[PDB]
Amino acid sequence: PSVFLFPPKPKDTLMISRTPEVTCVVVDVSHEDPEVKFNWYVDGVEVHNAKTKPREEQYNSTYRVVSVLTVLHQDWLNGKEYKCKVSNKALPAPIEKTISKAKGQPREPQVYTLPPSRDELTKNQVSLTCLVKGFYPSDIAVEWESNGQPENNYKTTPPVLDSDGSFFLYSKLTVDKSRWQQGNVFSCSVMHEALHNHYTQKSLSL
Amino acid sequence: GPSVFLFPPKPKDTLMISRTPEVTCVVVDVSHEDPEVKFNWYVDGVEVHNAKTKPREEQYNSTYRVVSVLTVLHQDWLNGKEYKCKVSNKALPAPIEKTISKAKGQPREPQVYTLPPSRDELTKNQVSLTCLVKGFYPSDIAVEWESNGQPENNYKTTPPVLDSDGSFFLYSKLTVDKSRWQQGNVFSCSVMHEALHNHYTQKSLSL
Numbered sequence A: 001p002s003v004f005l006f007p008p009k010p011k012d013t014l015m016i017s018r019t020p021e022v023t024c025v026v027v028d029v030s031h032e033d034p035e036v037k038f039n040w041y042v043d044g045v046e047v048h049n050a051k052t053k054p055r056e057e058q059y060n061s062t063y064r065v066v067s068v069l070t071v072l073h074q075d076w077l078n079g080k081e082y083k084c085k086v087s088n089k090a091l092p093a094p095i096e097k098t099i100s101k102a103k104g105q106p107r108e109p110q111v112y113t114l115p116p117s118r119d120e121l122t123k124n125q126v127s128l129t130c131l132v133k134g135f136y137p138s139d140i141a142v143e144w145e146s147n148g149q150p151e152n153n154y155k156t157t158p159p160v161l162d163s164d165g166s167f168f169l170y171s172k173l174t175v176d177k178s179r180w181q182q183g184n185v186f187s188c189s190v191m192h193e194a195l196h197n198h199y200t201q202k203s204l205s206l
Numbered sequence B: 001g002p003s004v005f006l007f008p009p010k011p012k013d014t015l016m017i018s019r020t021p022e023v024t025c026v027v028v029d030v031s032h033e034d035p036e037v038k039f040n041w042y043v044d045g046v047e048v049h050n051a052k053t054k055p056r057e058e059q060y061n062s063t064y065r066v067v068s069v070l071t072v073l074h075q076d077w078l079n080g081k082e083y084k085c086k087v088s089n090k091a092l093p094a095p096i097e098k099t100i101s102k103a104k105g106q107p108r109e110p111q112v113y114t115l116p117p118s119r120d121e122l123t124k125n126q127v128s129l130t131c132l133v134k135g136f137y138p139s140d141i142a143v144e145w146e147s148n149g150q151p152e153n154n155y156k157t158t159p160p161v162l163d164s165d166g167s168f169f170l171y172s173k174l175t176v177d178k179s180r181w182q183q184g185n186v187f188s189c190s191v192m193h194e195a196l197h198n199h200y201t202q203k204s205l206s207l
């Protein structure tokens, strides 16, 4: 049996309206031993808010038991430490897995929008590029809009550790060349904890 | 018991006949009770005997580590031949087998575009030169920066990202002093991929 611990979504922790949560996933539970017990602690103090989602039966005669704990936005952003304690009959000793936010001074991202290369103008579609660099930690959310409507044909690279100790990434939005040439306005939206109101956007148009 | 890992060649090694592409089979957690290890190599299911096995190395956790390296032909790898490493040990109920090959699928030619720094970034001491590569399959690729015939140092490249059409794309960012950019120096982004003619292409960028 193995224990995995997953952090909340960056967008959930940056907006008060949303609900962030820490997920503790237990895999490779055998048929003979389906009993799994969960204990949650926050900086040592034990909490009792966790809930256990229904367990799945996978393609190899095992079970995946998942426990979810809701966290406060400010506790996570302050660097509080969350640990998941798992006990099972097959285990010799209880397993403890620990997670928290990355430590360090947060740094404000810089957002630049880049128009399509002149070479790409011969194609039927063009690439709109959003460059975000110099931010820390790596938790971040990027979205594209146009006239207040979310564009959906975009892909974002994972954060990459830059040479100065910060992170950078690129986001690529693909639109029809006709939409670009007509003067439409496209925006790149960035959410990070070091930004004022955790939000900024840069526009891009011909 | 022992665990087996199988590593593919480096992309530059398969794309240039001057270099030597290799496939590495690694066996870890070999106990002192049964330190003997045997390797059997198979190319498309046919056994080969030109592999080089290196003497076992004792790790500080009281376990041995044995490595076997097979040299491959460039055209064999690019044609999708499967390579199989078979590891035999007396502590194993059965031999362990691992197979590796190039990703299946029709190759697609990369498109390379160079993007100048954003006008907003010109207020900084450092500016960002962006190289965009998209539409390539498989994801094995090499991206390098150079200027005036000499390689550049301060560049980073993102991992390949699966796009919406089933092909890959990535970005490479070169960081230079604004003074060098504004003086008209020419920076070029060179890309190595199997779908390219001569496996090499180059796109320049300057002011």
Ligand SMILES: *[C@@H]1O[C@H](CO[C@H]2O[C@@H](C)[C@@H](O)[C@@H](O)[C@@H]2O)[C@@H](O[C@@H]2O[C@H](CO)[C@@H](O[C@@H]3O[C@H](CO[C@H]4O[C@H](CO)[C@@H](O)[C@H](O)[C@@H]4O[C@@H]4O[C@H](CO)[C@@H](O[C@@H]5O[C@H](CO)[C@H](O)[C@H](O)[C@H]5O)[C@H](O)[C@H]4NC(C)=O)[C@@H](O)[C@H](O[C@H]4O[C@H](CO)[C@@H](O)[C@H](O[C@@H]5O[C@H](CO)[C@@H](O)[C@H](O)[C@H]5NC(C)=O)[C@@H]4O)[C@@H]3O)[C@H](O)[C@H]2NC(C)=O)[C@H](O)[C@H]1NC(C)=O
Pocket (backbone or CB within 6 Å): A004, A006, A007, A008, A009, A020, A021, A022, A023, A025, A027, A028, A058, A059, A060, A062, A064
């Ligand atoms: C028998 O079957 C078992 C189950 O069957 C399934 O498993 C597969 C075989 C597959 O074929 C399935 O078809 C099959 O049904 C199987 O159990 C396997 O075991 C695997 C390992 O043995 C394990 O792989 C690991 O996966 C994790 C992450 O897994 C997530 O992502 C995958 C996709 O990549 C998802 O498919 C999966 O469901 C998991 O989902 C993520 O977790 C949650 C839950 O969804 C999400 O978070 C929440 O999301 C919600 C919304 O959905 C909310 O947003 C909420 O707020 C969130 O919290 C999360 O988003 C999901 N992810 C995504 C993308 O959506 C990988 O991380 C593992 O990679 C490891 O790689 C190295 C190599 O060892 C490890 O070292 C490393 O560990 C850590 O690395 C850190 C580095 O940063 C380091 O700091 C740590 O110290 C280090 N830890 C340790 C201990 O070293 C990584 O962990 C790895 O690939 C499979 O996930 C698991 N199955 C399932 C279903 O989970 C058995 O193997 C199989 N065989 C046998 C013999 O039993």
Ligand SMILES: *[C@@H]1O[C@H](CO[C@@H]2O[C@@H](C)[C@@H](O)[C@@H](O)[C@@H]2O)[C@@H](O[C@@H]2O[C@H](CO)[C@@H](O[C@@H]3O[C@H](CO[C@H]4O[C@H](CO)[C@@H](O)[C@H](O)[C@@H]4O[C@@H]4O[C@H](CO)[C@@H](O)[C@H](O)[C@H]4NC(C)=O)[C@@H](O)[C@H](O[C@H]4O[C@H](CO)[C@@H](O)[C@H](O)[C@@H]4O)[C@@H]3O)[C@H](O)[C@H]2NC(C)=O)[C@H](O)[C@H]1NC(C)=O
Pocket (backbone or CB within 6 Å): B003, B005, B007, B024, B026, B028, B029, B059, B060, B061, B063, B065
């Ligand atoms: C006893 O100790 C062994 C050696 O550890 C070292 O020595 C001891 C004394 C300590 O000092 C250690 O701190 C020290 O590290 C352990 O062996 C290790 O076992 C683990 C698994 O149990 C192996 O992890 C696997 O690593 C794969 C990648 O490994 C490459 O990259 C490593 C750096 O990140 C590098 O250290 C490796 O040597 C290897 O390097 C590549 O080698 C090839 C061929 O030589 C080259 O072509 C590449 O260019 C090299 N690349 C680089 C970057 O250098 C992972 O891919 C792999 O993950 C895969 O499998 C897991 C399942 O386990 C999947 O979940 C995952 O998705 C993925 O598919 C895995 O993590 C590790 O490599 C071993 N170390 C060595 C040196 O071989 C023993 O485990 C330990 N025994 C016990 C009981 O503890």
